[PDB]
From Swiss-Prot, chain A:
The lineage of its organism: Archaea, Methanobacteriati, Methanobacteriota, Stenosarchaea group, Methanomicrobia. Keywords: Ribonucleoprotein, Ribosomal protein. PANTHER family: LARGE RIBOSOMAL SUBUNIT PROTEIN EL15 (PTHR11847:SF4), RIBOSOMAL PROTEIN L15 (PTHR11847). Residues 159-172 have a biased composition (Basic residues). GO terms for cellular component: cytosolic large ribosomal subunit. It holds the Pfam family Ribosomal_L15e. This is Large ribosomal subunit protein eL15. It comes from Methanosarcina acetivorans (strain ATCC 35395 / DSM 2834 / JCM 12185 / C2A).
Swiss-Prot record, chain B:
Keywords: Cytoplasm, Ribonucleoprotein, Ribosomal protein, RNA-binding, rRNA-binding, tRNA processing. It holds the Pfam family Ribosomal_L7Ae. Multifunctional RNA-binding protein that recognizes the K-turn motif in ribosomal RNA, the RNA component of RNase P, box H/ACA, box C/D and box C'/D' sRNAs. InterPro entries: Ribosomal_eL30-like_sf (IPR029064), Ribosomal_eL8-like_CS (IPR004037), Ribosomal_eL8/eL30/eS12/Gad45 (IPR004038), Ribosomal_eL8/Nhp2 (IPR018492), Ribosomal_eL8_arc (IPR022481). This is Large ribosomal subunit protein eL8. GO terms for biological process: ribosome biogenesis; translation; tRNA 5'-leader removal. GO terms for cellular component: cytoplasm; ribonucleoprotein complex; ribosome. Belongs to the eukaryotic ribosomal protein eL8 family. GO terms for molecular function: ribonuclease P activity; rRNA binding; structural constituent of ribosome. Part of the 50S ribosomal subunit. Probably part of the RNase P complex. It comes from Methanosarcina acetivorans (strain ATCC 35395 / DSM 2834 / JCM 12185 / C2A).
Swiss-Prot record, chain C:
It holds the Pfam family Ribosomal_L2. The gene is rpl2. One of its GO terms (cellular component) is cytosolic large ribosomal subunit. Keywords: Ribonucleoprotein, Ribosomal protein, RNA-binding, rRNA-binding. Belongs to the universal ribosomal protein uL2 family. One of its GO terms (biological process) is cytoplasmic translation. This is Large ribosomal subunit protein uL2. It comes from Methanosarcina acetivorans (strain ATCC 35395 / DSM 2834 / JCM 12185 / C2A). Gene3D superfamilies: 2.30.30.30, Nucleic acid-binding proteins, Ribosomal protein L2, domain 3.
Length: 196, 115, 238
RNA sequence: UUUACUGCAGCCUGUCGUUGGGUUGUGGUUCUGGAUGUACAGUGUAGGUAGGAGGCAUCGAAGCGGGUGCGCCAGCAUUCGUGGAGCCGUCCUUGGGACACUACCCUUCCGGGACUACGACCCUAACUCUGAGAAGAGGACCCCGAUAGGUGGGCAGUUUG
RNA sequence: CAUCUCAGUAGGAGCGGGAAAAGAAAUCAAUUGAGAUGCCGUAAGUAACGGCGAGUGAAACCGGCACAGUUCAAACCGAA
């Protein structure tokens, strides 16, 4: 079958535990642990996924590995008097996924760019790693572009901290239509947050 | 396997130059991969500096299953320079000898010896 | 919530329970020596350390840097020290415990190699080497227990100076008051049965008695492990 | 305040992940050498069972060995031989099962090799501590995320007609 | 009074414009149909939940306001 090499990379990352990618994981995890919270990397770790999510090789497009802990929302026991249903907090995991946390940290680190998408790249017993694709709206190469000039608009500022990314809309309960989405569209706030 | 001697690699680069000026070469990972899949490659040249390594990982087993002679090259810069390009090229492929056919077959025999 | 206890207040680290660090002369640790090195040095002065109530020695080494050292008894101004692997056994030198003979006294022993010394450091204490097996050596700690240490551990030979510090009774609240000003401890301490039931598990009542047994299990939550923590026995020997 | 009712932190322990490479004892999983299948024996070893029997055989079939799969040191296999016939059974050892080659597909035999889960031991390369660093010390344990059970006036909400 | 209710309310952190959010079916229907989204009316205090107690509580069909559809990834060419 006449197939592109993106297909082969996709297949290789389809089942990481049963290919050559496991050894590469073993080497890469050490170097990744030595690094910081947010790091700029020249090339994406998985080319096919990045191209699928809207990555091109031009100026003004940046890619970054973020580092986020595992587990639920670490929550404090209430100091004062609750009612025995609000008193417990150890089993109460959060309401925000880990991709959203990763993208928000990346946005906080880069004040001039704007988040586009992200994807899963690895994980171990203490950490998870994602890569976030960032686009610069004030670069002339982006402005001339016809498939990316929508980001040079006054409604795309802070695009990641208002739940407009793909993971944000997954977490808002708006990944589908029909039954079950009675109280999740066009927004959570519109229904007094009884959805989600 | 055994890494090919330096004279073999220089012979491969010279044949690459000759087929460039005279024949036809697909250069670029995507075009060379599709050429191997269809099956027309006289010889496959692959660099060994790729990070991430997934770019050229599939080439080896695919070529060996398709019965295609693949060689390894030390760096991207010289492979890119050979193809007639100011930028590095990860993998090229001699689709058509043009005039360097004899280098094609004798490099194939040399690779059989090394394997 | 009946008020937290004194132990939890020490946990927070309020200024009343923090050591007055600026009074102390210096931290005591062994000289740092690379592999297969042996540096020497002769004492320059004998000095008083307010953090332990015992003397310390100032030693100037051949490289140039001077260090305060835990002073073993008999150390005198002028004597040279030969810390290193090739040192001989004498009162004052620092040598591995693997090649220390049985019966010799040591002090300032380390836990793992190149710690600087953690055991046997108060006044007049000392430890002994008992046995030398191939992989370990057993030293009898001043508490009275046997500890199995690595043969490549460093410890100065002798006993710590200042022996007999507690043969002189206080006989006043004033003298013990003066000692406590250079420590983190609080002085004086109220007794639990004289407090209120908010303050302590034992407080309250029309007369001063504990009310509940003083021995507490090892699994009691913080804020309750007060008294005889997980005692195996009580009383004097009849 | 407590051995009032209901809960929640803290702590103790099992399981899953992080988490790798060997030493062997475990059990099947899985695989070979023989239908191993045999008491009323046998000329025969129920070549499971079974067209209740018909092809093999100096053009290879027998009684015997320490005994060759194995068992009743009998004897179907032709194996290392040994004599140089065990033929089917409509002479059924007239059967627990009565038996003949292109069938053993299957009592079984079980280097049990093989991935697996357990208990113990060893190793270093993950990981942890110390050091400016070389390096040293531990080590797949601990810490950590999740889940299950306990203890728990440490703390919370209430009731006490 | 403990599940429930008060209520996702009061309060907090982040982002942000003249509006914002949503938006072109892996949809809703029922036998056979409709054809992006938002807002208003109705369905309806109905279905559903609940010491089945007190209470909480929709959507689709249907009528209106206003109407608008498209762009990438890949297969083919390989710097055009
Ligand atoms: Mg940060
Ligand atoms: Mg908008
Ligand atoms: Mg109390
Ligand atoms: Mg109470
Ligand atoms: Mg109340
Ligand atoms: Mg602002
Ligand atoms: Mg949208
Ligand atoms: Mg409600």
């Amino acid at each position: 079958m006449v197939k592109s090499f993106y297909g082969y990379v996709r297949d290789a990352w389809k089942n990481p535990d049963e290919t050559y990618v496991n050894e590469l994981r073993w080497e890469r995890l050490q170097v990744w642990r030595k690094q910081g919270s947010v790091t700029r990397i020249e090339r994406p770790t998985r080319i096919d996924r990045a191209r699928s999510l809207g990555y091109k090789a031009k100026q003004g497009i940046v890619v970054v590995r973020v580092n986020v802990r595992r587990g639920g929302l670490g929550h404090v026991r209430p100091n004062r008097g609750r009612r025995t249903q609000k008193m417990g907090k150890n089993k109460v995991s959060g309401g925000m996924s880990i991709q959203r946390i990763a993208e928000v940290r990346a946005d906080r680190r880069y004040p001039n760019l704007e988040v586009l998408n992200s994807y899963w790249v690895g994980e171990d017993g203490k950490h998870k790693w994602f890569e976030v694709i960032l686009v610069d709206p004030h670069h002339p190469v982006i402005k001339s572009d016809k498939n990316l000039n929508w980001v040079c608009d006054p409604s795309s500022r802070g695009r990641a901290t208002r739940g407009k990314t793909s993971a944000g809309r997954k977490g808002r309960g708006m990944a589908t239509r029909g039954k079950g989405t009675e109280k999740t569209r066009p927004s959570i706030r519109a229904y007094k947050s009884r959805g989600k | 396997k055994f890494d090919v001697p330096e004279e073999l690699t220089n012979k491969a680069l010279e044949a690459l130059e000759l087929a460039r000026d005279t024949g036809k070469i697909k250069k670029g990972t995507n075009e060379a991969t599709k050429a191997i899949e269809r099956g027309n490659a006289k010889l496959v040249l692959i660099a060994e500096d790729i990070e991430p390594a997934e770019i050229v990982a599939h080439i080896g087993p695919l070529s060996e299953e398709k019965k295609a002679p693949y060689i390894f090259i030390k760096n991207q810069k010289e492979l890119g320079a050979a193809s007639g390009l100011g930028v590095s090229c990860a993998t090229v492929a001699i689709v058509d000898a043009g005039k360097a056919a004899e280098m094609v077959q004798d490099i194939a025999q040399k690779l059989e010896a090394l394997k | 919530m009946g008020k937290r206890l004194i132990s939890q207040n020490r946990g927070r680290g309020t200024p009343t329970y923090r050591a007055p660090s600026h009074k102390y002369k210096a931290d005591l640790r062994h000289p740092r020596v690379d592999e297969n090195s042996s540096l020497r040095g002769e004492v320059v002065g004998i000095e008083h350390d307010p953090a332990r109530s015992a003397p310390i020695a100032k030693v100037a080494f051949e490289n140039g840097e001077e260090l305060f050292l835990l002073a073993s008894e008999g150390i005198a101004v002028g004597n040279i020290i030969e810390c290193g692997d090739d040192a001989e056994v004498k009162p004052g030198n620092i040598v591995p415990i693997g090649n220390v003979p049985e019966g010799f006294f040591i002090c300032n022993v380390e836990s793992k190699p190149n710690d600087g010394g953690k055991f046997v450091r108060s006044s007049g204490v000392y430890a002994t080497v008992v046995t030398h097996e191939a992989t370990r050596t057993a030293v009898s700690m001043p508490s009275g227990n046997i500890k199995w240490l690595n043969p490549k551990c460093r410890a100065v030979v002798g006993i710590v100076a200042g022996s007999g510090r507690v043969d002189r009774p206080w006989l006043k609240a004033g003298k013990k008051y003066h000692k406590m000003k250079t420590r983190a401890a609080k002085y004086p301490r109220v007794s639990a049965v004289a407090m209120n039931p908010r303050d302590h598990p034992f407080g309250g009542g029309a007369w001063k008695h504990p009310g509940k047994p003083t021995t507490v299990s090892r699994n009691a939550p913080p804020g309750r492990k007060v008294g005889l923590i997980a005692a195996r026995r009580t009383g004097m020997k009849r």
